[PDB]
């Protein structure tokens, strides 16, 4: 039927949106490199979690479709 959609969410991930965009440690050195790095890692982890959520949805959908096809 029409209007059947599974929506995968893609957010562009480069050094710019991740934070740093430029990293100095030799001194201007960033004030809190650890916090920025941890937040950058956390954003990646959140995107990975969303990805896992979408594989689960997709494989549940495909197994449902395969089950329904035999019945029809």
């Amino acid at each position: 039927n029409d209007g059947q959609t599974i929506t995968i969410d893609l957010k562009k991930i480069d050094s710019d949106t991740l934070g740093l965009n430029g990293f100095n440690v030799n001194g201007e050195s960033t004030s809190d490199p650890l916090a920025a790095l941890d937040d950058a890692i956390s954003q990646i982890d959140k995107f990975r979690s969303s990805l896992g959520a979408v594989q689960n949805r997709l494989d549940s959908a495909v197994t449902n479709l395969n089950n329904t096809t035999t019945n029809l």
Partner: protein
């Protein structure tokens, strides 16, 4: 003889009617089984979320997977159908001819 033929033809048609009915029931049962499996996965990872050792960020991923599973349950409930009839979407009573 005419009455016999009438009843015989009626029962022959009612047989195919009952086969259509069992097909409808099996198609419904498949979607119910899928919803069951989704619910079991939800209860699984809710059990993981229950413990206090999890941080807020981890609980965010757990909630995201909950929302994905609920959306899947919503879709399977809504857009499943047989013969163009949304069997699970709306509450209703369906009749099946069985006799002449």
């Amino acid at each position: 003889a005419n009455r016999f033929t009438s009843n015989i033809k009626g029962l022959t048609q009612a047989a195919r009617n009952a086969n259509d009915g069992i097909s409808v029931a099996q198609t419904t049962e498949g979607a119910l089984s899928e919803i069951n499996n989704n619910l079991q996965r939800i209860r699984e990872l809710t059990v993981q979320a229950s413990t206090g050792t999890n941080s807020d960020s981890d609980l965010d991923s757990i909630q995201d997977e909950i929302k994905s599973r609920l959306d899947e349950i919503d879709r399977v409930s809504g857009q499943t159908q047989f013969n163009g009839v949304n069997v699970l979407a709306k509450d209703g009573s369906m009749k099946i001819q069985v006799g002449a």
